[PDB]
Amino acid sequence: GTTVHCDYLNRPHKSIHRRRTDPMVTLSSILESIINDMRDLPNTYPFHTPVNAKVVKDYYKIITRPMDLQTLRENVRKRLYPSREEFREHLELIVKNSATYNGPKHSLTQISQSMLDLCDEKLKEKEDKLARLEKAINPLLDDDDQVAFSFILDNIVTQKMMAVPDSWPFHHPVNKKFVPDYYKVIVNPMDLETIRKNISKHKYQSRESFLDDVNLILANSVKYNGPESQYTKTAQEIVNVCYQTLTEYDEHLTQLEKDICTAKEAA
């Protein structure tokens, strides 16, 4: 057995720094600006900061992934968003949580939606400028091999992994409401939906990076459910089906990995 070698995929290291003219920074500015616009919208103050557990004692027991404009701004400053996609995904979480806790039609949810609508209008307004920044941050976004690679992986997830019997519990993030202590035991949650969203954003340039997330699903199940749990046996099968399929696509994937590596280097 052997694997493809590529030294440019893990470069530069995350030990790199913050330059003002850095593309990632410039983007953080446009995004933070949109945050100021949503915060300025009438009656949005409930979403400006995290829910106060002292006031709403059951909020963090019902909401799996909490989000607010303050936390959103913090993430932007830490340059956690390589593109508008990652940004919008976190933003809509505010709308989703309000729908879950207050109701799909609650006035609060409608208000949170107004922030999301404004965000989209802003994004579509700075369409081109945003496109160039995202491409400058990750040239691979416009690379056909990277796109072909992602497309194949996404099919491994939807065609093979999600097809495993009883696999549903691993299709989406564990819902805290039904498994109250899950996140107190699992500090590195992972699930098939999250992996698909990463694939959509071309996070993986090789099988290895893809498997680092795939493996977490089984590892987490072993940790929370136990080595002999029925849930772990299912997760084991999800991984096994993924591995088996990877060997079947070895020829195509190896070639794509080499091209992506070449494109990664040229970038």
Swiss-Prot record:
Residues 1-267 are annotated as: Interaction with ASF1A and ASF1B. Residues 18-126, 140-249 form the Bromo domain. It is found in: Nucleus. Phosphorylated by casein kinase II in vitro. It comes from the Eukaryota. The Bromo domain mediates interaction with histones that have acetylated lysine residues at specific positions. The second domain also recognizes and binds histones that are butyrylated and crotonylated. The TFIID basal transcription factor complex plays a major role in the initiation of RNA polymerase II (Pol II)-dependent transcription. TFIID recognizes and binds promoters with or without a TATA box via its subunit TBP, a TATA-box-binding protein, and promotes assembly of the pre-initiation complex (PIC). The TFIID complex consists of TBP and TBP-associated factors (TAFs), including TAF1, TAF2, TAF3, TAF4, TAF5, TAF6, TAF7, TAF8, TAF9, TAF10, TAF11, TAF12 and TAF13. TAF1 is the largest component and core scaffold of the TFIID complex, involved in nucleating complex assembly. It is linked to Dystonia 3, torsion, X-linked: An X-linked dystonia-parkinsonism disorder. Dystonia is defined by the presence of sustained involuntary muscle contractions, often leading to abnormal postures. DYT3 is characterized by severe progressive torsion dystonia followed by parkinsonism. It has a well-defined pathology of extensive neuronal loss and mosaic gliosis in the striatum (caudate nucleus and putamen) which appears to resemble that in Huntington disease. Intellectual developmental disorder, X-linked, syndromic 33: A syndrome characterized by intellectual deficit, delayed psychomotor development, delayed speech and language, and characteristic facial features. Component of the TFIID basal transcription factor complex, composed of TATA-box-binding protein TBP, and a number of TBP-associated factors (TAFs), including TAF1, TAF2, TAF3, TAF4, TAF5, TAF6, TAF7, TAF8, TAF9, TAF10, TAF11, TAF12 and TAF13. Interacts with TAF7; the interaction is direct. TAF1, when part of the TFIID complex, interacts with C-terminus of TP53. Belongs to the TAF1 family. This is Transcription initiation factor TFIID subunit 1.
